[PDB]
């Protein structure tokens, strides 16, 4: 994946997260908990539906075409009829194969992007109060109970509220 989050710094997926595509787990003063993020899960889904609808649209109607099966040997004109259709079929097959390859490639980067975007977003919110331990988890350097975890997850986390606490026991160079 271009961004290196999925199958990257986020080692593996959670088979347990049955309620969204991306999400949070935490272990804070009052115990462990998991919760899916619905905003990035929709972002991933809507893009995938968009491309899916564009490729599932527009069947062209065709009525009287050329005959494509013969039962008598005719020579030159029949030779041409078979060539026109065979070259048509090979060109459309090339198109279907390059299309799903191109697409699939892009879907893996798109869903990977959303992962990394959620990460970067959570990173920015936590400002000086957390350090990335580089495995997709942040160490939050201050007492952060379940409501604090709820506010990081719903984007209302005020970092200033805990800046001094965090900052102090983050840089307490004394060991």
């Amino acid at each position: 994946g271009l961004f290196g989050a999925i199958a990257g710094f986020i080692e593996n997926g959670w088979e347990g997260m049955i309620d969204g595509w991306y999400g949070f787990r935490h272990q804070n003063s009052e115990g462990t908990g998991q919760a899916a993020d619905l905003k990035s899960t929709q972002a991933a889904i809507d893009q995938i539906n968009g491309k899916l609808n564009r490729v599932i649209e527009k069947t062209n109607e065709k009525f009287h075409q050329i005959e494509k099966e013969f039962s008598e040997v005719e020579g030159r004109i029949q030779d041409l009829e078979k060539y026109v259709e065979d070259t048509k079929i090979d060109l459309w097959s090339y198109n279907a194969e390059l299309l799903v390859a191109l697409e699939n490639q892009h879907t893996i980067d798109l869903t990977g992007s959303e992962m990394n975007k959620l990460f970067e977003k959570t990173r920015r919110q936590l400002r000086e109060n957390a350090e990335e331990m580089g495995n997709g988890c942040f160490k939050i350097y201050h007492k952060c109970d379940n409501a604090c975890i709820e506010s990081i997850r719903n984007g209302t986390y005020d970092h200033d509220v805990y800046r001094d606490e965090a900052l102090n026991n983050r840089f307490q160079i004394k060991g």
């Binding site: 593996n12 088979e15 991306y22 272990q27 490729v55 279907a96 490639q105 879907t107 959570t122 942040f138």
Partner: protein
Amino acid sequence: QDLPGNDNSTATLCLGHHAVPNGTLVKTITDDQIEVTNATELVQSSSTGKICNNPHRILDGIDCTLIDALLGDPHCDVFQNETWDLFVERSKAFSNCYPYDVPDYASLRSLVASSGTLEFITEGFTWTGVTQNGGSNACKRGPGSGFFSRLNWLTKSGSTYPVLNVTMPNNDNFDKLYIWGIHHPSTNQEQTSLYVQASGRVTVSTRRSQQTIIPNIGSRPWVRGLSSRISIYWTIVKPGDVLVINSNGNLIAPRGYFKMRTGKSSIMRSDAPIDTCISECITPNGSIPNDKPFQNVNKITYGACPKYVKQNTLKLATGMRNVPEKQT
């Protein structure tokens, strides 16, 4: 802001993404088997096996070929003045009437099949000096001898097959398709017996064209007791034009014209049963659902269908990479 807390502790937040135990494989630009959470199949690969009779007008030819329905082989008189979006030609179709051949059968079947109608208008042709309504014991109208319903076999009066020279204007608003023919006798005695002259001649002309066919006397293989053939020809007469049929023998005269239409009609050979259901895509294997963009059922199709592709499966990933932790 707040007052000093005695406790000093941290917390841990981890981001991640779901994974499924099962998971489908998909092709990419750089790998051809990568496992994703979910995929959707883009190639329609199976027919119901039945031609849905809705919404297109499907006319089942039963044991008639469209050309025999047109000429009017007795066993096909059912189809007179019929109409279709798709005419289905069955493998079991047969003919039992005078042995004929259609030089460029291929185009006659095509242009009739796109016209989509077999509507016949009888015209008042007046054949002066010849015997009309000739038939054959190889083409039975019930108990008796007969012929194609739309053709008129002319033979001499007394000892004279005059030079026929008739005309029929197209004062109408539309193009008219006339089907006519020439009889090829098998023996010289047969030629002279029927048409008196040693060599017949048929010239059918409009202002825009002409065609003169001369018959060919000789033995062909026995088909329904006959060693003779008739060859079929077609003339379209545009509005304002005139048909002139001139012959001194062997003419198989038109009894009027077929109306030509311009529509979306076609013909399809298939033995698939017609059934009541609604499907817009028809292939000779039966109807198929046009939900998917591509199909692999058959390259022959009528209606709104998926594009035929060689691939029988093409999966579009509709989910992220599947990176499970247990496995399953």
